[PDB]
Amino acid sequence: ECKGSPLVVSLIGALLRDFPNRWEYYLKQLQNKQFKRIRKSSSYDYEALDEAMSISVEMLREDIKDYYTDLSILQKDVKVPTKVLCILWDMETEEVEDILQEFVNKSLLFCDRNGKSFRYYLHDLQVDFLTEKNCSQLQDLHKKIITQFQRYHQPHTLSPDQEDCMYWYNFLAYHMASAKMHKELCALMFSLDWIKAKTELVGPAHLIHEFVEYRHILDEKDCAVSENFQEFLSLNGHLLGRQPFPNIVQLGLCEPETSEVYQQAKLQAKQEVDNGMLYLEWINKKNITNLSRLVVRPHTDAVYHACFSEDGQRI
Amino acid sequence: ECKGSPLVVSLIGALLRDFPNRWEYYLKQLQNKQFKRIRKSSSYDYEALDEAMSISVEMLREDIKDYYTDLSILQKDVKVPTKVLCILWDMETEEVEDILQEFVNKSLLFCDRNGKSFRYYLHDLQVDFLTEKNCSQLQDLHKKIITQFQRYHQPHTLSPDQEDCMYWYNFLAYHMASAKMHKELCALMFSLDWIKAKTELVGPAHLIHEFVEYRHILDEKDCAVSENFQEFLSLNGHLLGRQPFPNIVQLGLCEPETSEVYQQAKLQAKQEVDNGMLYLEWINKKNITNLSRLVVRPHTDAVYHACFSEDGQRI
């Protein structure tokens, strides 16, 4: 938790000198992520680590000051391509970099000179302070970024070449969740074609991870839809990644029951059918296949051994 | 672009230390001609080059201060004969020089002791600052100078001996354009006799250059008139300059169609005819001559070789 801010270590450390017994307490306290709990009088000039950050924020000229807060939304550990910052700001790129350069000097946002591209990012402490001091706004802004992206690229209108897009796959999903807009979340994550492109360069793991987050966000009834989709994924992992991304629209019409995943497939098939494509219907599914919960291909080359983590968290 | 103001070079140079990647950007930026974009904190006492000039302008006594702005209109690279400044000012010559002498001391307008004549002129940076700080006025003033010239010499009333006149050929054409007065522009540039005098000491190239500028300024329909005139020029270059400036009024009645150039010629011819001059009409033009787009005589002495610029811009 300390993340090497020796100020936190001395701050925890002294704090412990008084109460050797309450050892776990502060552990869970930093697990809490609030630094208001930790305080010590010290040679250092501030009660606490939260105390230091507040002093840094004030100096910025009023025009700059508002912008930092937008900067609040960004993940603890994402080096975002400059563009997305351009989009949220809606301000031209040559200009946008320079304000950020001023920040980096303020040492409030670390630089990343990777090639022409720049990824700026924060310390875990810097991020935590932000939520500590900007939390009420953040839910509100979470809806601001999305609308701006809507004023530009649509998710289907997204492209492989654009630098920002992967952030957009990987995390756009993320913003809508904070937004708390579930219908919009349906407008994005549900879209099977979005799944197609995401599985094209992302792979079929990120979507599953998103789905677990997804389940709380929307509705229990949909959760079943998510359950149907996860069931649709079980068949995806084994051969889906290879390359010849077999026309899923055709391999999809294999699920049972109906749910929302199957309903989508039949209609798509009907649409395909009049045009052509010679899809063959399958009539025995309910009579066949005892489905496995999951399948993995780690290697194009034959497997020789595998082992569980002792924790069981990984293999 | 820098023009050797080491302040600009250091200013660009430091500016680049931070962002080695955005190299072209500032190139086009200075191509823009605005210096508000370039800024660096520096040992030097000003954010930017625009910043320095503003400091110089303020000192001048209020009576002088208004005058400088008039000085704004002058080309980046023209050494104007003092007189034209007298005309715009409408203030007597012995007096006019001295205020300018005070400027030269203010180092805001370089001196030119060429003979009795004086041509004052500016640095490219000095000129750029002016438009940067006086642009709204400039369109307005552009109409002020012309009216004053009207209170004095008419373009036909212009003479070869007068010192100012060549500036008047070369650039009077220029002022009317800013003026945005197109009917007045017709009152000047169209006048064939004005073309005659201009081609008498200027040569037949400046007018062509003016015409390209001319086309945007007026009307598309006239543009055709300009197209007809340029076509009338195609025949001008080859033999027109020599000396015996053959009575154009007679050699003019050769164009085809009609346009505005031919219409002028027939009437002129009719006017000449009653008096005399024994002009011979030509009845076969539409039946004869496949006109070349352009003709050049560079030398009275036989040509031996010629070559295109690799860029193709010149020969």
XYZ file of C-alpha atoms in Angstrom, chain A residues 153-283:
131
model
C -16.299 8.141 -33.048
C -19.117 5.664 -32.559
C -18.027 2.268 -31.187
C -18.749 0.683 -34.568
C -17.080 3.719 -36.124
C -13.946 2.830 -34.139
C -10.893 1.716 -36.159
C -7.770 -0.445 -35.693
C -5.245 2.189 -36.836
C -6.279 4.955 -34.440
C -3.949 5.092 -31.425
C -6.621 5.744 -28.780
C -8.947 2.892 -29.648
C -7.408 0.148 -27.535
C -7.890 2.317 -24.484
C -11.377 2.677 -25.791
C -11.856 -1.070 -25.963
C -10.087 -1.791 -22.782
C -11.531 0.975 -20.730
C -14.469 2.639 -22.533
C -16.410 -0.228 -21.153
C -15.129 1.097 -17.875
C -16.484 4.667 -18.041
C -20.110 3.788 -18.777
C -20.137 1.762 -15.585
C -19.313 4.775 -13.454
C -21.763 6.718 -15.583
C -24.330 4.404 -14.044
C -26.151 4.449 -17.361
C -27.234 0.872 -17.886
C -29.200 1.371 -21.097
C -26.116 2.927 -22.665
C -24.141 0.036 -21.267
C -26.512 -2.155 -23.234
C -25.874 0.107 -26.206
C -22.198 -0.809 -26.020
C -21.148 -4.045 -24.334
C -24.058 -6.123 -25.588
C -23.295 -5.380 -29.216
C -22.025 -8.670 -30.611
C -20.013 -6.950 -33.331
C -18.279 -4.932 -30.637
C -17.448 -8.278 -29.111
C -16.136 -9.309 -32.507
C -13.726 -6.433 -32.881
C -12.742 -6.645 -29.230
C -11.946 -10.341 -29.575
C -10.084 -9.519 -32.784
C -7.222 -7.591 -31.125
C -7.972 -7.873 -27.369
C -8.640 -11.587 -27.118
C -11.540 -13.309 -25.359
C -10.390 -12.728 -21.772
C -10.926 -9.029 -21.218
C -14.602 -9.275 -22.139
C -15.146 -12.009 -19.554
C -13.473 -9.856 -16.900
C -15.672 -6.929 -17.916
C -18.760 -9.128 -17.693
C -18.193 -9.930 -14.029
C -18.082 -6.186 -13.394
C -21.018 -5.933 -15.788
C -23.371 -8.117 -13.753
C -23.680 -5.803 -10.740
C -24.021 -2.719 -12.943
C -27.154 -3.628 -14.909
C -30.013 -5.971 -13.939
C -30.462 -9.455 -12.488
C -32.711 -10.488 -15.377
C -30.037 -9.399 -17.848
C -27.536 -11.220 -15.647
C -29.147 -14.302 -17.154
C -28.463 -12.791 -20.554
C -24.892 -12.411 -19.358
C -25.100 -16.016 -18.177
C -26.223 -17.005 -21.668
C -23.372 -15.027 -23.223
C -20.774 -16.550 -20.906
C -22.193 -19.903 -21.952
C -21.718 -18.695 -25.522
C -18.103 -17.913 -24.637
C -17.390 -21.376 -23.236
C -17.395 -22.515 -26.864
C -15.333 -19.492 -27.910
C -12.036 -20.053 -26.111
C -10.889 -23.339 -27.633
C -10.813 -22.523 -31.348
C -12.063 -18.929 -31.600
C -8.716 -17.117 -31.428
C -6.770 -19.020 -34.075
C -7.408 -16.863 -37.143
C -10.108 -18.004 -39.576
C -12.536 -16.349 -37.152
C -15.241 -18.738 -38.375
C -18.450 -16.822 -39.135
C -19.660 -16.761 -35.529
C -23.102 -15.738 -36.784
C -23.234 -19.304 -38.104
C -21.503 -21.083 -35.222
C -23.642 -19.106 -32.785
C -26.907 -20.843 -33.637
C -25.968 -23.733 -31.349
C -26.969 -22.508 -27.889
C -30.023 -23.946 -26.111
C -33.140 -22.483 -24.484
C -33.270 -19.022 -26.054
C -32.232 -16.219 -23.702
C -31.088 -12.995 -25.368
C -28.015 -14.454 -27.070
C -29.960 -17.045 -29.064
C -32.732 -14.622 -29.987
C -30.117 -12.375 -31.548
C -28.647 -15.235 -33.560
C -31.802 -16.493 -35.230
C -32.733 -13.051 -36.506
C -29.214 -12.437 -37.756
C -29.347 -15.760 -39.555
C -32.681 -14.892 -41.148
C -31.196 -11.614 -42.361
C -28.184 -13.429 -43.813
C -30.326 -16.121 -45.406
C -32.320 -14.127 -47.949
C -29.105 -12.682 -49.343
C -27.351 -16.045 -49.390
C -24.553 -17.655 -47.365
C -26.050 -21.135 -47.413
C -26.227 -21.454 -43.634
C -27.224 -24.922 -42.468
C -29.755 -25.132 -39.640
C -29.095 -27.617 -36.807
C -32.046 -29.537 -35.325
